[PDB]
Ligand binder design. Structure first.
Ligand SMILES: CCCCCCCCCCC(CCCCCCCCCC)(CO[C@H]1O[C@@H](CO)[C@H](O[C@@H]2O[C@@H](CO)[C@H](O)[C@@H](O)[C@@H]2O)[C@@H](O)[C@@H]1O)CO[C@H]1O[C@@H](CO)[C@H](O[C@@H]2O[C@@H](CO)[C@H](O)[C@@H](O)[C@@H]2O)[C@@H](O)[C@H]1O
Lengths: 48, 367, 75
């Protein structure tokens, strides 16, 4: 029900600054734990 | 601690809802006939001394913290003949009103929701012999504990169950020092299809199908004093979830859980007697027991003591219970208190359960 | 009046004090009755108790002689 506004934090002001930190993860078929910020892999075999 | 407890849907069906049975260590399958004899044994409704009875029972949760979080019960029995009786019970566990608000507007119409769980059941009891009776009960269970938000549907989950009960009450038999009375009872309850809280055939929970077998004896002194000792054994009729593994590493557990969850309730009732690496000695660990003694003075004062013990490996709910009952003219008031003896914090600690019943209609002679 | 920001929260919610004497005592209780959150000298509106397991919780607000008990949902 809310109008679409170019103001996301609802402070009535539109910010135009672009000072941020950037992180990235790869999406590949054969990813494993220990790289790409991967900490755990749970393989589920029999899904109903 | 608890090792692989049995998980079932709507566990509130297993909570004692009246003060009389609460004071007797959560047993009623073989005690004297009373208005609250619907959760325990409807078959003794045919043995009721009074024609018609109504009862309101209150079990508060978080007594100090807040009200409205409680299990209430309304029971009404009516024995039309000397041989049969119709009874109807309504158990309601509720948290009271909860207000849902997303903005700090002082003037804002907000949504008040009451998550709850109620079971409405009706039982017919018929006296087969002069000392034995059967009973069949139909129960509808509805759970509305979740709250409607985004990406969450609060549709209530419903189910049906059938209860088969039997009660035996012997004649008053004279002995050397007293003239006591024997009672026995059995009850197979909560027999029905699984309840799906997510409304999906893939995810369903077993109903808490239960088997209760008990026996009791009354020592009658001077015809005005009674001392009834009762013992009840309770066993869940639901398969025990697999533990370490009964065939990679997690794949064995996944296969075991898939096998366990793909079991019908009818087959699950019979599978409950076993389906574990342990034998009969370990099978006896699935049975919980309760022993109580109730003293009756002038049939108007009742002092009840009880002890309830579950296995330490499941549930872990052992306690002692005290209860007092007073009948003024036709109104009986029961109060119950619980002293826990287990390591897990019982939510019924420091709680005084209340029960209030009215009896009306003509009197039926006891045989 | 005491106002609780979104009732079915994830553990992070807010208080709706009406700009009065800010020091109030807030206590969050589990369904077991256990004490799971204490907060004296409280003035920050945002409350972060998202380490608690899901369920209903009881929030007691003590503001001078005023005592208030409300029920919140953590899902
Ligand atoms: C599905 C259940 C429906 C609910 C059942 C309610 C039954 C009400 C009947 C009143 C009653 C039971 C007390 C129950 C109170 C529990 C209230 C719980 C409160 C909850 C928080 C109180 O009667 C007692 O109470 C006194 C009132 O203080 C009465 O005083 C006086 O009371 C008034 C003269 O009676 C004066 O007008 C008043 O001036 C006096 O003061 C006394 O007469 C008496 O001591 C006596 O029962 C008697 O009334 C009839 C009615 O037709 C009942 O008929 C039954 O109805 C169906 C049964 O439902 C059955 O199917 C049906 O077969 C059967 O014919 C019988 O039972 C009968 O024996």
């Amino acid at each position: 029900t809310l109008p679409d506004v170019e103001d996301i934090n609802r402070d009535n002001t539109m910010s135009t600054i672009n000072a941020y930190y950037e992180y990235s993860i790869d999406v590949k078929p054969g990813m494993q734990v220990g790289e790409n910020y991967i900490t755990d892999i749970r393989e589920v075999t029999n899904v109903d | 601690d608890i090792e692989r407890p049995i998980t079932t849907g709507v566990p509130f069906l297993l909570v004692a809802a009246d003060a009389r049975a609460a004071g007797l260590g959560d047993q009623g399958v073989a005690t004297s006939s009373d208005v609250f004899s619907q959760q325990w044994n409807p078959a003794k409704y045919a043995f009721a001394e009074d024609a018609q009875g109504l009862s309101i029972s209150y079990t508060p949760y978080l007594t100090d913290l807040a009200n409205d979080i409680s299990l209430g019960q309304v029971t009404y029995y009516n024995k039309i003949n000397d041989r049969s009786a119709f009874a109807g019970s309504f158990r309601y566990f509720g948290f009271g009103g909860i207000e849902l608000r997303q903005t700090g507007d002082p003037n804002e119409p907000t949504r008040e929701v009451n998550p709850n769980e109620f079971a409405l059941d009706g039982s017919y009891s018929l006296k087969l012999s002069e000392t034995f009776s059967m009973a069949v009960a139909a129960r509808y269970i509805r759970s509305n504990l979740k709250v409607a938000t985004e990406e969450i549907d609060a549709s209530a989950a419903g189910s049906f169950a059938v209860d088969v009960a039997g009660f035996y009450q012997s004649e008053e038999i004279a002995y050397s020092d007293f003239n006591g009375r024997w009672r026995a009872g059995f009850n197979i309850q909560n027999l029905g299809p699984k309840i799906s809280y997510d409304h999906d055939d893939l995810s369903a929970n077993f109903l808490p199908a239960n088997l209760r077998v008990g026996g009791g004896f009354d020592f009658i002194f001077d015809d005005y004093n009674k001392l009834g000792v009762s013992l009840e054994l309770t066993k869940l009729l639901v398969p025990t979830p697999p533990g370490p593994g009964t065939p990679s590493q997690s794949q064995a557990d996944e296969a075991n859980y898939k096998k366990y969850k793909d079991i019908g309730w009818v087959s699950g009732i019979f599978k409950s007697f076993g389906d574990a690496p342990g034998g009969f000695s370990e099978e006896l660990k699935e049975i919980t027991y309760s022993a109580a003694a109730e003293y009756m003075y002038q049939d108007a004062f009742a002092m009840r003591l009880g002890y309830y013990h579950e296995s330490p490996m499941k549930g872990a709910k052992q306690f002692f219970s005290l209860g007092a009952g007073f009948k003024y003219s036709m109104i009986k008031v029961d109060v119950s208190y619980l002293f826990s003896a287990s390591k897990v914090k019982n939510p019924l600690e420091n709680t005084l359960r209340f029960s209030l019943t009215f009896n009306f209609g003509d009197k039926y002679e006891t045989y | 009046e005491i106002v609780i920001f979104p009732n079915p929260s994830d553990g992070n919610f807010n208080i709706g004090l009406n700009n009065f004497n800010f020091p109030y005592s807030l206590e969050i209780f589990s369904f077991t009755g256990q004490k799971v959150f204490e907060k004296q000298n409280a003035s920050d509106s945002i409350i972060s108790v998202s380490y608690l397991p899901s369920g209903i919780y009881i929030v007691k607000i003590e503001k001078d002689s005023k005592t208030t008990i409300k029920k919140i949902i953590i899902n």
